[PDB]
């Protein structure tokens, strides 16, 4: 036992990586509207940053990208494809962009 | 739509 454990934190703690796509996968961009992920991230931040914790905002981004987007391509290899973003959290607390 |  070591009650002085709380005197250190891991050097990798308090990072959050919001990846546009799952490990191993391509990430989709639209030449006119921008990338699927960044489009969706900005929309959800504008709508919910005064209302929801950040992980719940990013979960809404996951749902938006997963449900509303599908690729269109003349190349069968790249046509009708889907994307899911990937939230990687080493955070130790809830993150709200607003304060009291 | 393009990949990158």
């Amino acid at each position: 036992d070591d009650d002085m454990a709380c005197h250190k934190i891991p050097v990798e703690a308090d990072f959050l990586y919001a990846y546009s796509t799952a490990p191993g996968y391509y990430s989709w961009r639209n030449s006119k509207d921008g990338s699927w992920f960044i489009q969706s991230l900005c929309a959800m931040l504008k709508q919910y940053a005064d209302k929801l914790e950040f992980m719940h905002i990013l979960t809404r981004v996951n749902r938006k990208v997963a449900t509303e987007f599908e690729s269109f391509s003349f190349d069968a290899t790249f046509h009708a494809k889907k994307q899911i973003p990937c939230i990687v959290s080493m955070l130790t607390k809830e993150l709200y962009f607003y304060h009291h | 739509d393009e990949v990158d």
């Binding site: 990586y17 991230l41 900005c42 | -």
Partner: protein, 146 residues
């Protein structure tokens, strides 16, 4: 005072913090990498979004691998004591674990290591957010009907 809870990051420092946006659109011809059309739409959207969240936004365009590393090193050496958080957005070509400068790759670990708790003391205990718009490989998701 009364009973206290410590479940959320302190976000009422004088400043929300920096939001660094690295927007790589045009790549050196020798790399063989295509232009990322539409990425300026992303960078502008992010600039406006994080401006409204009261971040100090810095937009950088078309950085070499050496410039990306120098920028991250310099930012990690700033005094963040009055800032609540740190945000970095990377818009580029990529592979698993890798983001591309205009002339070649940068390991994502090299970028994030500058902000490790033992290397950036004024961000210790504060959220460090990395938003990465880049490929992580070449797999395609065919989806399934619902």
């Amino acid at each position: 005072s009364g009973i206290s809870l410590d479940n959320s990051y302190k976000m009422d420092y004088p400043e929300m913090g920096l939001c660094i946006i690295i927007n790589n659109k045009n790549f050196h011809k020798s790399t063989g990498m295509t232009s990322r059309s539409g990425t300026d739409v992303d960078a502008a959207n992010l600039r406006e979004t994080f401006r409204n969240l009261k971040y100090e936004v810095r937009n950088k365009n078309d950085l070499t691998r050496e410039e990306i590393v120098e920028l991250m090193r310099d930012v990690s050496k700033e005094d963040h004591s009055k800032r609540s958080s740190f945000v970095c957005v990377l818009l580029s070509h990529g592979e698993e674990g890798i983001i591309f400068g205009t002339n070649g790759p940068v390991d994502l670990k090299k970028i994030t290591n500058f902000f490790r708790g033992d290397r950036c003391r004024s961000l210790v205990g504060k959220p460090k957010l990395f938003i990465i718009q880049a490929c992580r490989g070449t797999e395609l998701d065919c989806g399934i009907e619902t």
